């Protein structure tokens, strides 16, 4: 009949004094040790119910999916989105935009041979670019993001960016900068005090300029499409949305208008780029750290695929080890540690607790990815967490990097195809040489807040 228990908050600052903005995950897990897997925390004035561990998260987001299907907030992103767009919208707006987005993504090849061919082709471009380095030590950050970003870019903008495109690099920097900021102490402090901070000088202002930069770019691309639009022959996601907008012009209450187009497109562009990119980057670092794992991956690739042909998505079924490795990378990486906030759609009764309608919820995906009840050694990187005795792939109900439930990631299909084809093709063609000794490679995160960011590093890609 009452909300989950938790530390007594103070007016306005909430539980700020009982938290550490540089390590929110750790702070909440600590409080969790005292109040239990389901507790209440006050992030500044924001009252939030925190769900820790697999059971609590699944019970809420899956067993009571409709009740927890609301979209919470992320102050930094809300600065530009203001509740528009598929990701941060709620109610009728979210229902229309999500349905349309999923359909439009599929119409443009997502989950089909079309997008697979697009990915294989861009993968071929990654290979060329890596060979272009001549085995020199480099920062793989943008090599990876350019390739990844061109996949979702092909869908939303009609086609790919040239790797030499300076505005392209510029946009990628904006995305990287935003994910970093939201994962820093100030970024997490902003989640608590955005009401005042959005108006104060500080790092947040610089972050805002990056978002503004992305919005301007999108608004620009949309204008260009508008003035070259063939109502019966859409080239991309944008044209599709524009056509829908024309069809809905006479509906006072349609959700299909310019702001939702711009924001939805911006969200998919960022969503489809930085998440996959960060994962690839963390993955290669993890493989250099564990030579024994790269060795096995090479054995499976050579046997199953060989050295001549391009790997294809169907090869995954014949490659249990690679599938286990990518899973372990996503589990260890814990890219979106606290997921994207949800909120109860209406008054809810959850585990003998009462959550009034509108209550914000923090599904601690990281605590699920490292639930000691589902993984033998959660803190270690070990592909075995995903293999049975005969070395066959073993799924886990605790594997939730894309979250679960009604507002789960609908980019998962695309993401998985990308992770498999990029990782495999790169490993088929190169062995990884780290700038330092494996024993010395630090795989602990550089930042953890909204996202998990790996430490900066360099490496070389040596031909096989
Ligand atoms: C390895 C890559 C990715 C990870 C780890 C990931 C993770 C997430 C997570 C944790 C959520 C929130 C789920 C929830 O609220 O329950 C989410 C939502 C979302 N993701 Fe992803 N994602 C990835 C890639 C993608 C890609 C490639 C796209 C783009 C096609 C994308 C599109 C979205 C969208 C549009 C949402 C919002 C859905 C809604 O509000 O209904 N994601 N993602």
From Swiss-Prot:
Annotated positions binding heme: 409
Entry keywords, A to Z: Endoplasmic reticulum, Heme, Iron, Lipid metabolism, Membrane, Metal-binding, Microsome, Monooxygenase, NADP, Oxidoreductase
Catalytic activity: 1,4-cineole + reduced [NADPH--hemoprotein reductase] + O2 = 2-exo-hydroxy-1,4-cineole + oxidized [NADPH--hemoprotein reductase] + H2O + H(+)
Expression (tissue specificity): Liver.
Impact noted for substituting residue 98 to L: In allele CYP2A6*26
Topology term for the membrane: Peripheral membrane protein
Coiled coil regions, renumbered to chain: none
Substitution effect: residue 101 to A: In allele CYP2A6*26
Residues that bind substrate: 77, 267
Subcellular locations according to the entry: Endoplasmic reticulum membrane; Microsome membrane
Induction context: By phenobarbital and dexamethasone.
UniProt GO MF annotations: arachidonate epoxygenase activity; coumarin 7-hydroxylase activity; enzyme binding; heme binding; iron ion binding; oxidoreductase activity, acting on paired donors, with incorporation or reduction of molecular oxygen, reduced flavin or flavoprotein as one donor, and incorporation of one atom of oxygen
Effect of residue 80 to L: In allele CYP2A6*24; increases phenacetin O-deethylation activity 4 fold
UniProt-recorded name of the protein: Cytochrome P450 2A6
Phylogenetic placement of the source organism: Eukaryota, Metazoa, Chordata, Craniata, Vertebrata
Gene: CYP2A6
């Amino acid at each position: 009949g009452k909300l989950p228990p938790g530390p007594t908050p103070l007016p306005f600052i909430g539980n700020y004094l009982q938290l550490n903005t540089e390590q929110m995950y750790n702070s909440l897990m600590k409080i969790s040790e005292r109040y239990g897997p389901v507790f209440t925390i006050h992030l500044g004035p924001r009252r939030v119910v925190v769900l820790c561990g697999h059971d609590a998260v699944r019970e809420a987001l899956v067993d009571q999916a409709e009740e927890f299907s609301g979209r919470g907030e992320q102050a930094t992103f809300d600065w530009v989105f203001k509740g528009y767009g598929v990701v941060f919208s709620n109610g009728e707006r979210a229902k229309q935009l999500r349905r349309f987005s999923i359909a439009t993504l599929r119409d443009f090849g997502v989950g089909k041979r079309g997008i697979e061919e697009r990915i294989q082709e861009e993968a071929g471009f990654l290979i060329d670019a890596l060979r272009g380095t001549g085995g020199a030590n480099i920062d793989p950050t943008f090599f990876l993001s350019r390739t990844v970003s061109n996949v979702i870019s092909s869908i939303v903008f009609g086609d790919r960016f040239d790797y030499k495109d300076k505005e392209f690099l510029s946009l990628l920097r904006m995305m990287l900068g935003i994910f970093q900021f939201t994962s820093t102490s100030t970024g997490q402090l902003y989640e608590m005090f955005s009401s005042v901070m959005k108006h104060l000088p500080g790092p947040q202002q610089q972050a805002f300029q990056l978002l503004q930069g992305l919005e301007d770019f999108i608004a620009k691309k949309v204008e260009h499409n508008q003035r070259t639009l063939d109502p019966n022959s859409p080239r991309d996601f944008i044209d599709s949305f524009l056509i829908r907008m024309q069809e809905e012009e006479k509906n006072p209450n349609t959700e299909f208008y310019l702001k939702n187009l711009v924001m939805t497109t911006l969200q998919l562009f960022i969503g489809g780029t930085e998440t996959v990119s960060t994962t690839l980057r963390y993955g290669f670092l993890l493989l250099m750290k564990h030579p024994e794992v790269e060795a096995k991956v090479h054995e499976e690739i050579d046997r199953v695929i060989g050295k001549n042909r391009q790997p294809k998505f169907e090869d995954r079924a014949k490659m249990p080890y690679m599938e286990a490795v990518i899973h372990e990378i996503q589990r260890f990486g814990d890219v979106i540690p606290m997921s994207l906030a949800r909120r109860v759609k209406k008054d809810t009764k959850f585990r003998d607790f009462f959550l009034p309608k509108g209550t914000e919820v923090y599904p601690m995906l990281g605590s699920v990815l490292r639930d000691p009840s589902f993984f033998s050694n959660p803190q270690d990187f070990n592909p075995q967490h995903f293999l049975n005795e005969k070395g066959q792939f073993k799924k886990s109900d605790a594997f939730v990097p894309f979250s679960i439930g009604k507002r789960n990631c609908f980019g998962e299909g695309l993401a998985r195809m990308e992770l498999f084809l990029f990782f495999t093709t790169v490993m088929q063609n190169f062995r990884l040489k780290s700038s330092q000794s494996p024993k010395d490679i630090d795989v602990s995160p550089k930042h953890v807040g909204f996202a998990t960011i790996p430490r900066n590093y360099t490496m070389s890609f040596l031909p096989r």
